Design a protein around this ligand. Sequence first.
Ligand SMILES: Nc1ncnc2c1ncn2[C@@H]1O[C@H](COP(=O)(O)OP(=O)(O)OP(=O)(O)O)[C@@H](O)[C@H]1O
Lengths: 49, 144, 49
Amino acid sequence: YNLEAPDQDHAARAEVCSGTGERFRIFRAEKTYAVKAGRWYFEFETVTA
Amino acid sequence: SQIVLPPHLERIREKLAENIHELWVMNKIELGWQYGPVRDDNKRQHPCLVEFSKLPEQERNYNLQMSLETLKTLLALGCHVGISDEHAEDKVKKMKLPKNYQLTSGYKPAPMDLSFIKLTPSQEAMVDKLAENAHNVWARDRIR
Amino acid sequence: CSGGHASNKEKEMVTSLFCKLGVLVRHRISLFGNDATSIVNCLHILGQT
Ligand SMILES: Nc1ncnc2c1ncn2[C@@H]1O[C@H](COP(=O)(O)OP(=O)(O)OP(=O)(O)O)[C@@H](O)[C@H]1O
């Protein structure tokens, strides 16, 4: 009984799987620390990709 | 339930079931298994060692039903099957096995699958899927 | 990942088309009226594809 299988159907997750209905949380500094002049630098460490 | 079984699979299924029942009796034989009336695992006695004819009819019914469910799931996953040739079905020819490795059953279990037998990754994945499907059915039985 | 899956039979017949085009262009360049360079470029891009 040579069973002819269907071709392996490749499925792309494409951000469908996700928790709740809230998509992204935005983090920012306080409004009073706005910079109007000068040259400024800060770092962002990416724990995950 | 919506699945329908092709006639070659009905005709194959009964002796498939008896042969696989024998296959588990030999797997437990090579695991160290000596027949007995009571069903104790620690004592090592259990009535299911015997052939399909002396196999209790209620375990026989579950074996045939699980064979039918496995083949129906196989068709339900979209995997078609056909008859390659009548020769591979007719032949059960094998080199003789020692009485230590054999039971009183006459026909030798394993066919001549030395290197020619092979499962492609799709076949192995489908074997996996059948595994969790059987596990899910068993889990629903325990939930009931 | 969503689409663009070139069929295996499609790739097979693309290779067949490349082979038969290579056979056609062979031994018959003089008949073509200087578009043989265009045929060479076509065969080239077929090779890359
Ligand atoms: N669906 C089933 N149909 C028939 N017999 C079964 C079924 N499930 C278990 N059994 C029987 O019950 C006993 C339990 O052994 P089994 O092969 O299930 O695994 P086990 O290693 O003993 O572990 P567990 O305690 O998880 O069942 C065996 O005698 C087995 O033949």
